[PDB]
Hints:
The complex is a heterotetramer, with two copies of chain A (about 240 residues) and two copies of chain C (about 5 residues). Chain A has about 240 residues and is α/β, with parallel strands linked by helices.
Amino acid sequence: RLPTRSDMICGYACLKGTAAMRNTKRGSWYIEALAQVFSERACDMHVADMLVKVNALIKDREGYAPGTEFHRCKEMSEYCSTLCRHLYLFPHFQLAYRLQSRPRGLALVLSNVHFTGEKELEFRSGGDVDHSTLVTLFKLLGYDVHVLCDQTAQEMQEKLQNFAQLPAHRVTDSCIVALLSHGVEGAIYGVDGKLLQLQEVFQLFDNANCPSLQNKPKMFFIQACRGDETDRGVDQQ
Amino acid sequence: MRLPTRSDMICGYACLKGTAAMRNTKRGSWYIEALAQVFSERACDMHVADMLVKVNALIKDREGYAPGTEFHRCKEMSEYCSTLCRHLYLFPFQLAYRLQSRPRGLALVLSNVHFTGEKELEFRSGGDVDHSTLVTLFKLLGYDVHVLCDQTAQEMQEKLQNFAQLPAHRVTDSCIVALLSHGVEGAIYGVDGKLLQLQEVFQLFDNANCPSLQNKPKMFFIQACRGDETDRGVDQQ
Amino acid sequence: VDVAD
Amino acid sequence: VDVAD
């Protein structure tokens, strides 16, 4: 018997209560760093240790935006884990999750960039680079990549559930879900300015609702703000 | 180079948001027992984040013994979150945090077991075993262990601040704080039934409030419930 | 026996 | 330039 939820790792672009930073031309700091590390190190580093390298890149970066509150601002990424083994992507086998299927798993990249005005949510310039980054990266890592763009909260919920329920998960070894949008602590916005709670997303993939993925590693990457606080940072003593 | 307000922290949680953490009335808490077992055996060759994965695996496999109650054959899942930027080896070197000081750091073990509030919080049987287990473990790992027992919320806030402000942190290489009590999502109870928000605990040790620990690894272990939901578990398909 | 925290 | 998500 299993707990209701296990074997997930969830990477967050920023800390609870704070904004995640995005360059209007290069894309989000977190996705940029994530793909930079994964592309270089997926061959010899497990995913949790790779996210520590990502943390180190984000800790060192600072904002460029002269004349605004984001100039010289800071951000800190984090990850949370219910993994019970090393997660090597194998693009060591005995103490790691089994990860040999072809494809290695299904991946979903869900990007909201153009918003329909209902709330004050702005165009996410650079989100196109983030989207291209993850689609290409996950394909090169051996995943069968599904894509969704500019979805409402209800479309997100319905299509995430459809993705979780796909029969293909029975014959793969892992899963990836990447969500990129505006958001608040614990929830992400659809393009209509309505919220999808992240706990409801994770539940779609848990051991009760998604038996096809029981005991298989499930990766979530969340590029979204978690609040309104801009981190001014601190001087090193 | 400047720092984010918060970084270089790892926080282990006995259970998931919204759920109960389980404790055996004679053997103590599942999470503390697994943490001490793994850390005692593997600190010499495994970094802390990877040891917490081994703890996750022990918790995932355990099931409740409480005949005739709702906790019989129940389940639990632990997790950890990390803003670490290097490997954390305790060394009881190159790619890891520096961890060579004598003592390796200060450690605080704060345990509340006797409650007398307008909230209906029961005596935490087995909490004494958890307390002595952690004091023994952290001494064994080379920490100077400070202890606190049966504190109110205000006492916990004030004495956590005093601990974070101790001058010894200037020259040591790491810090450990263990909090064991009743709790709710995001906060723990003092013996008076009043809550201390965990976000205020972490803030006391952050880069702005605790400059002596900037860029040094800070470990937190939280043995407390995070909600009222008992996990009945799921049959493995 | 097991109880909740 | 850098902006907030």
